[model samples]
Target: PISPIETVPVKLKPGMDGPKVKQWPLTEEKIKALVEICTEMEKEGKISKIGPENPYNTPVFAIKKKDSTKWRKLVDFRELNKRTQDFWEVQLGIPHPAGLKKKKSVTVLDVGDAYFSVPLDEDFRKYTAFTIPSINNETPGIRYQYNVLPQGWKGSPAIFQSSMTKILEPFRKQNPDIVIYQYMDDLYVGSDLEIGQHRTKIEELRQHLLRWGLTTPDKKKEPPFLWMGYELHPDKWTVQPIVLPEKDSWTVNDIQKLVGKLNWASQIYPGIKVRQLCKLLRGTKALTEVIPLTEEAELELAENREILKEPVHGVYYDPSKDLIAEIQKQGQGQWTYQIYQEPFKNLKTGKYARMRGAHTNDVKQLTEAVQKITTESIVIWGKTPKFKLPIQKETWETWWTEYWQATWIPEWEFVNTPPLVKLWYQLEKEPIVGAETFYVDGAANRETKLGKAGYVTNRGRQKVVTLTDTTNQKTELQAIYLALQDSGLEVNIVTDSQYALGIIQAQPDQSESELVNQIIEQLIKKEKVYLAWVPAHKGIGGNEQVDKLV
Candidate 1:
């Protein structure tokens, strides 16, 4: 129909081929409607019956028209659209629906069968070929290709807009008082004159479009007209809420679609705030993933729907009003202090002890302590550049168990030296009833390449054992292990090797030497073994005895 105005070919990208697809199944009513529609188009010379040898075949389906029992045929060209070149690469200057308050009257016109009115180049018609199921004994249905442009093709809007603008250029220049805004087939004509003058100008333009094979029926529109999905009255622009699926069955794609629609509406009507809805969709990845509607998101969705139902009667920009610009400081520097009372007075012993100062990462306890001091907001910029975590090879178990309780449960609460000091007070105050004390020593001879371990108990029970090739630390661990295996009862063990004492106290993970872990496991099983470090061969009776034997 618009062939007299202009014609443009659908260009495919370089080395791109049109897609071929089989027709999808349809209901009996839909199938009947499809046959009727294609037959009518063929009779009107808009399409041609083609042979099965055509390289392209796009599927077609029927959709029910709004408030009508009749169905409309839609071609599925999504696959072909990806392979085609974007011939109309330049952006089209489609005017927005603005300044409606200044107009005396506005008329919106929609072109009937807009895309079909534009004719396609002959060479590209085969790419838009389609098939229907057999009817009237015709095998493989009737294959037909379009001679004119179809709706689903991505290029249809660009081509139609280009032609429509060219056809109306002269008329727009001649009638400067009548402003005609076009977005593809939809046009909004506005004038500042009386309603009668505006309608006369619109009628004259309708006749001009008719001569160029474009037609808009005399569908009368009153005030508060709906244009481009927005309800535009003389004073304001508002949008209606889109129908959504039940919240329980919503998916990631559903929320994303809602976000896109709300964003467009918010741009036109700034009162429709959607921050909460947007925050709900953060961190979502997959499109098909089912999402549970959060309480925050649900409340915001209802609020926005209510906002859209009313006309925005608020302030407008006034040239006479003076504009004020103000700037203010938002945030100030935080005041904080650190705990520098190292070697804090031992509450039990009342003597100063060597306590490590609170390190940079040890500020959680400090912050909690500060929080309990006052209810006002206070920040602690605790920094200790010299202090380091007292854990070797990332084994923070010993440090954490003493200061931070239940570290695995993901809460930040650290105990001071009070827990350890209290434990020591009880131990020093009470004496054991039947605790057997033993002195252990180990020696490794480089010449013989052999090791020896020996232990001497306070009750005169003594034993010496030979060990395979081993280091000094291993020999010491073996000596203590053998003493524990023989005792079988609650015992107090003294070791001269500081390396063995350090490893046992640290209680490292499995990444440490297996012998150290084995010793720890033995201590856990016995549950009553007490280990202490004593100076070796310093005239101590049991220490000298074990040293001489080993």
Candidate 2:
């Protein structure tokens, strides 16, 4: 073999007392010397032309690889590596071995990268180290340390992986049910059924790293419980737990999502907000330019506009005119009364005594004579006494006295009796009929009338047919009757007019006129024709289309 080369410690940085160093420092003179050497090498065709310094102060040097087709720039990350230690440590909890209840089957845990870490070496230096300020608006490119690995050092990824494997060597010997893996700071563990086995395995590895003076963020719990900022459950991964912010405020993205949701819900939500949303969604589309007003609403608006032009009077009141006042006064309070009086009288008779307006002597003599005659009359009549008229003396009773002595009568006897007059009855003798007629009318305009169009339809063939008159009131009734007749239908006619309706309702005998009598007689004779009245115009009353036509 060749002579063994003496091992010498290279001091990468001056005044640094550590087993690992950042990088070899290059001063201005050193950079000049290196540039000259590179320039000579290029002249000799041994290397490419030297590169210039980065404007942003990112340390870099260019060199020509032996087999490379192009010159490459290597970046120095000594400062970046030193600053990596300043990153805030996020503590993650891991349970103890005994704390985890393992199952019989193998349990696997997956950990994704919390932060990407690339290996630092020749490959890294050639591909990732150099800066290209002009390419990305003067932004500096990738940089890394080449001397020793730091937390954020470009070479830290491979070193951390190797170091973790070495640290976990003891646990691996125990034939652990769990296997631990590390890629930079990202760690994952898998296990075959064992109670608290994964926790114990991770704890052992953690302690080994601690003994080597590796700084691990202080976490109150155990290892293998969480990795890469994600909670490691037994079977699945979960986002790390965090407290929520107040409800009143919302993020920009959240409000955007809410707007979309509200738009979709607009169809079923019946509120002013829903309408407003619809209007917003419609935007400035031509179709939404105008909204039609109902006839009633249009009329109301017109009336309001008219009223606005007129001046209003303050506090005016008008009582009824003389005609109305006279009519009211006719029925005002009125009364009537009647009375009668009779005088007392005395009389002397042969059979009985009577009291009249006579003296006491005449009353006494009459009483004596009456007693003598009553005793004789009682003997002849057997059961009772009766008054006897003297043949010689004329009856002294006055006609007025006899009338006054008659049975009393009520005052109502003097009331007048109402007169009775024969009322003439008249009725139409037209037979019930049907007509195949259709009536149409437009509601918005008075002149826009629709009438019997003579259009044949299935309804026209029916026995009980109805014609719709979508126009004036008179046209509607005529159409219905015509439709009945045209359809060869003989049925009772019905209308919504009060006068016509009353005529149909009147009893046959009650109709005094000859016309009414004739109509009633014809109706009674056929017994098939009937007339009825229907309430008109009211929304729910009668056929809607017919009402519209009328």
Candidate 3:
């Protein structure tokens, strides 16, 4: 641990102090000599003006003291602290959640050092003006025994922050899209877009700082500076280390305040078995106040901490290449073998001749040969070739119905078709179905369209069809109803051209229009047919295939 330095005590005034030295009994000759020296120093570029408005002006302050003595020197009361309200207080409202959810692209700059000038008190200036021998073998100069303001002098950090902000103000105004924030010497400039608009702003800020006599440290000046761990290219944010506080160690609050934040980054420090560690820590109150560690726990924590220091690895497998290799390995050689059967010479031959070899690759050839042979010969004919039977007609339908009922139908339960219809009608077209038509609908995007179409054929085959010429969806539904009607069935229909199927499936009472309800009721009561709802194109076999056809 470092010990504190011995510091001189000084008294401070309530406000800005006036200049020290009530009288400087310097002869005209001494004053002229001092002016000539100052001019020579200026010509040698030893000092410069701070700003355009204050030419040749540099910050000066007087040292103040409670008692005037040789041992106890005076202190500067000019470095008075000023408190300002937090600038973000009023601006800290609920951020747009949509905006907050997006990852931000940022550019950062670090300003070296900034300080404010303090005015000196009269008595303090008298002692500070005396000349002294130079410590180095250089020319002797006035050794002003005055206090230079220390950093963290209450208002210094804020003053530096304000100065940096002012330097960046012009850039911010010019690039309205850019966002700028300064925290003392550290400046964060960024934008939400992936574009390098934020980077351009950063460059502008760097130039501004240079113009204002502030120089970024060479070590901190990273070329192609990365922000938020993302390397910003000319047009894109490349995956790179752009995160600030790039070190992986957690802060005090991160470790102590909330478990959620810890859990969020848990992947970084895996096998902390954080949950278990937390439980152990929580069990002991004293250990909770100060993080406790057993030998094994310490070992695990060290390992995780080391692991977290490394950058995250990103690796992906290529399925196409894998599949090609798999296919080549499986299809190496000929997969079929030929079998031989005995054969007779000619139909007219009194004496039968035995055949030497026969090709038995084809199922048809094998079947014919078996038919020609006798049962007793079957004992001689060792193994016989077999042919697979055709698949049962209902197998596909059964599996498809299971897949649809289990997967597709359940998802449709969430959809409020009436609301969808109302939205579609208001946005696109008015609903044709009166308040009474029953409606059924299905999901149908490129992937599921085929499934939705198939559903039309299977479930819709026995309902009355009204094909709307305006939309593929209506046409698909119309085809289903037509197929049903052809089989002597009738069903009511009400639809928006987009979801004609949904309109057809909704109950008559649910129909938005009376005409739609009346039509649906007539079909339902007059014809003994039930309504069915289908989700569009989600690989529901029947609906998917039918939708593809449409």
Highest-lDDT candidate:
1
lDDT of 2 by residue, 407-455 (tens): 2111111122112111122233453445222322212225544343121
Candidate 3 error regions (>4 Å): 1-107, 116-150, 191-203, 210-550
TM-score of candidate 1 relative to the true fold:
0.47
What's the C-alpha lDDT at position 35 in model 3?
40
List per-prediction Cα lDDT, in the order shown. 0.62, 0.33, 0.34
Alpha-carbon TM-score of each model against the true structure: 0.47, 0.21, 0.27
User: Mind giving the per-residue lDDT tens digits that candidate 3 earns over 1-550?
Assistant: 0111122223334343423322223334444454454444335332221222211111222222347621212223232322212222222322111111122465566655334222122233222232322323154333232222233343334434444555567777877776665655566655666546555555666776676656554423322445443333322222353122322443433344333333333322222234333444454354224444456545545544564565442121121221000000001111111111112111000011122122111112212223333221233222222211122224323333422122111101112211111111111123223222333332234543332322233334423322322245534454444443343333333222344434543222224344344444444433344443445555655444544444
lDDT of 1 at 455: 95
Better of 2 and 3 by TM-score: 3
Ranking by TM-score: 1, 3, 2
Error of 2 at 193 (Å): 10
* Cα RMSD for candidates in order: 19.4, 45.2, 29.0
Misplaced by over 4 Å in model 1 are 22-32, 51-55, 62-69, 89-101, 135-140, 228-230, 235-311, 314-550
Worst 10 residues of 2 by lDDT: 323-332
